[PDB]
Amino acid sequence: SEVVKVKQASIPAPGSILSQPNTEQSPAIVLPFQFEATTFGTAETAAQVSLQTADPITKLTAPYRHAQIVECKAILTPTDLAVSNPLTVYLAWVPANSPATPTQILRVYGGQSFVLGGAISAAKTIEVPLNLDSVNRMLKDSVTYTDTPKLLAYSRAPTNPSKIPTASIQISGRIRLSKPMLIAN
Amino acid sequence: SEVVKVKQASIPAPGSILSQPNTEQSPAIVLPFQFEATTFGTAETAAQVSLQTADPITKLTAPYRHAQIVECKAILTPTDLAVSNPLTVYLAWVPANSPATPTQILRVYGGQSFVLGGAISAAKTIEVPLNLDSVNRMLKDSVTYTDTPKLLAYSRAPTNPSKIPTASIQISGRIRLSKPMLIAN
Amino acid sequence: SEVVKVKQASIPAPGSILSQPNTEQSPAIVLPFQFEATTFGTAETAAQVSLQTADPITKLTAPYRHAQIVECKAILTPTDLAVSNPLTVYLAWVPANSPATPTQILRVYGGQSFVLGGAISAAKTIEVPLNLDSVNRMLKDSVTYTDTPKLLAYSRAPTNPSKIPTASIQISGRIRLSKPMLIAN
Amino acid sequence: SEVVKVKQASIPAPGSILSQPNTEQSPAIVLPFQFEATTFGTAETAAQVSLQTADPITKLTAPYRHAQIVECKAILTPTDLAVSNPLTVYLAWVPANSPATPTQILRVYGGQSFVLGGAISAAKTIEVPLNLDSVNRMLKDSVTYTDTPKLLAYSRAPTNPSKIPTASIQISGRIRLSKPMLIAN
Amino acid sequence: QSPAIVLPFQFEATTFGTAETAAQVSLQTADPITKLTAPYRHAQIVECKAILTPTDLAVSNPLTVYLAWVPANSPATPTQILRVYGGQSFVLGGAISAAKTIEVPLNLDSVNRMLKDSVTYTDTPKLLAYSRAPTNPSKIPTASIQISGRIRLSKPMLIAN
Amino acid sequence: QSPAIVLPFQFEATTFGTAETAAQVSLQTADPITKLTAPYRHAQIVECKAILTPTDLAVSNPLTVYLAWVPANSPATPTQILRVYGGQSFVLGGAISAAKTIEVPLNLDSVNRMLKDSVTYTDTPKLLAYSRAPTNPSKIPTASIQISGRIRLSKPMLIAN
Amino acid sequence: QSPAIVLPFQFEATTFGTAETAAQVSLQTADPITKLTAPYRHAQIVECKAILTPTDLAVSNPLTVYLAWVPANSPATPTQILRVYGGQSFVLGGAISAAKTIEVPLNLDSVNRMLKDSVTYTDTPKLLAYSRAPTNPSKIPTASIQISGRIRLSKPMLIAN
Prior knowledge:
This is part of a larger assembly, with 7 copies of chain A. Chain A is mainly β. Chain A has a single domain, classed as Jelly Rolls, CATH 2.60.120.20. Chain A has 2 helices and 10 strands, in the order βββαβαββββββ. In chain A, the strands form 2 sheets. In chain A, strands 1, 2, 4, 7, 8 and 10 form a 6-stranded mixed β-sheet that branches. A 4-stranded antiparallel β-sheet of chain A has the order 3-9-5-6, with no helix packed on it. The longest helix of chain A has 7 residues, at 55-61. Chain A is elongated and about 60 Å long. At the B-C interface, strand 1, strand 2, strand 4, strand 5 and strand 6 of B face strand 1, strand 2, strand 4, strand 5 and strand 6 of C. Strand 2 of chain B pairs antiparallel with strand 2 (7-9) of chain C.
């Protein structure tokens, strides 16, 4: 009632991995995480958040060599300001190497459009989960991948620009770190 | 915790829907969706979203003529602004044909009152799912239903109105679109 | 219908309570109670009741030192005044130690929004029961708990403020008082 | 969560009835009913609503000779106005012939005190059900009874008298009429 | 024994050299650990250390720091670190940090692993740290102590968003 | 698991005393290891050390050298050797070399044993070495570090000859 | 082997710095242990230590203290502490008390665990402590020795009240 989950587009594209867990059972740990991808309302927002390089996720996987995603999902959050200043957001999880750009989302299989601002519509948070069968689960490995999940988001330049965001995307989930990496403590 | 799901109180009220013939029907697709419903920091916000009428959960059902919401939830999102500029919100999911209005939320079995930010553990996404037995699940059929879900929220007029929203409400979920409509290509 | 019960969305969060010894304990009594929580027509109402501290569900537990709420619900009541002076309310039951504040209701999983009066079928008592798994059931034990039920409601500031309330919220229920305390007769 | 039920005091006092259903199976019908007992906030309210003579119930049982109660309950409803103008109500179901008066409620086994006004407490409706084992189930029979249920309610004179009620008691339930009575249509 | 997730944390608690420092941090109230556990209603420490890290400035103005972990009920104060079992004295100066770092782990049997629950426990970890008023201060910290470790969360709390 | 042959290698990677040296060698690109594995398409380290060898000149102009093995992904730089697990400090001076030599072995679990394959791995051995700018230089090296160990080759590569 | 209860005790026995101290305490007569066992007719030591605690004054006027536990029959005197098996020498001064404290435990096999009985045993614990006459006294004690441990009581004695 206060949260609604809407899946994206179905299409298997598993990627490839490292068959390093041959006769190994290296202890791993599962960490939850959640940060702020972008904000809407200040001005035309059209950012592309790559999970592999986003600071918050990095510093999380910093001391490890293998970081694997277990679950992950984008969360659209409207605020009171949205109630009177409608706006439309465009999400679409796509693997990093896709030539898709924020401005042309609807033109990629899975892009969807929401209308958070609703002055009539109910103000509930939307939840678009990442189908990690469409991209590559590995954020950080002994090899660099190209099917890394990337978040495409966009929203036309506002009519009544506000210095206080009207909507924000959050990206939460759980990672599986393992095989520590020597760093400077 | 970073996300807290507070289920809304309710009573079974299914809402009778039309039947299909023992003929050659069809398979469907399941699309997700998540749009911005309202904003809060600006001014006294008293919004009521009705799914069915408010796009985009319509720009989604446009090409089909049988939409059935499979799951749905309302998401509440506080912003760094509300950390020191507390506000109180009111959520409630009521069947479209209900006499209830944004200001009366608290007088409808199940109305809820969340106090975003300011408090001690505030500033944490709040989820209030829609109980698909309280309302009618048909968004678009061969008829036009009356008891479709409708989310109505409210928030007293701000004392220190912000240019940008302090908190928002997004609605997330998935729809089972089937039986495709013939249109002009 | 004259009464509509709209259950609040929620997730199990039991709240660990203390244990009693395998000794000679006692039988209890079950007392009912129903008090007036808030009013609405007057001005911007942003109230938060916490059971535990607010009497009378205390003037009731005074002679005992083990109070356990057995069932409990929040009642919304529109008045002939709201028939043509609509208003919107926000309900939500949250564990006392929650960061949520009256104004943020809609951002907590389960916040609800009722629109009393004005509408077409409005002006009908609305019930929003408290899910005794979301919060802690102990009102008064040998310790002082943190996660006791707490109802927070809100309603934007009225545009045509009334001398007498347009709508009210009462809390009804029963408590299992046991283990009697020695006092001065 | 939005409605809370609090039972009164346990004490069997069944009354007496008419053993007229010997070899009879006279068709009966069950009707629901709900009216406004009293209002609080205008001035000192201390009314005693006898179910047997209250207009609404009468005109309901008007065309019948036997009216029997099946279930019944008092509902305390606070309104927004209560939020800022606290007040305390006193309920207590007692059989009509009891020498109890509104002003001396707490002094009768079962009288309870609520604090609807809560500026801190949650604004939920309380629900005090009638234990029809304490009084007489028959509202109207071929004989006049004295154990008829009667509602005792009271509240000190207000501090800030309002022309708009701050709280109201509703009395709803179901009756079982039978053996029609010839009247003037 | 419910769905629970374990995640790490690390924040700096105290700073030395600016003046006589005799602080005592309580994990139960430290902000970082707060913002961390706010979304949950059940926090339990799984692992916890207190690393002492000096800076180049130490080689010029040596100082001695005193650490010690206590139940937070303990009447032990910052000046008594050395009379408290498992309290220690380090001499940061000409530091050089011969390979590994200064690390003082919290013995879990000593305290209460519960940081946030339904009751508010008393005996939870509290770090005691002291160091005499430096001979000649410095506007820049000569050395610091960070608290790191891992927490186990559960029982999702309702919050704004 | 095919016909493979294991052979040794040893080359000198860095030299100290000529000036402040803060080099970082990567086994994956070091020439000697190259000319070594060029004929094969699959190289895997079996054993690997880093020996530190000072000269008579050290007794006159003592120096301190810092070693540390890292994944080559690690943000650890030459100046942080001591804040990196398993980093070390030696004081070459009046050396005398009391019998055995200075030897820092590469822990294989720390990195990736694959030097040359079908993909180009990231986390392969990289030696971090540092030493402050000497008080008074010398045109002749005061001490050096050699990398030695054993490689396992397989899958013959086509080359000229 | 009757109803018995074990309770702790701890009292300070000697004080140093005021002058040449060469005292010898006997547990069997020490008042604290008395007022403790008076209500019972059977006392038996379960555990017993002798903690040596110096004060800030020690850093200014260092002293050396000598401890040793003896049967009380032993012809060993305070000046012979070092010629008595298990006697010790400590140098309280600049004390600093590096973490743990000075603790000399009484070996039970050495003496007689019975303090109060039906007969009056001879070989019961007696603490021997010595320290040369300080160079320059002090009206305030520089360091002290406390006896702590646990006693087992039984056979209720009739007393006033």
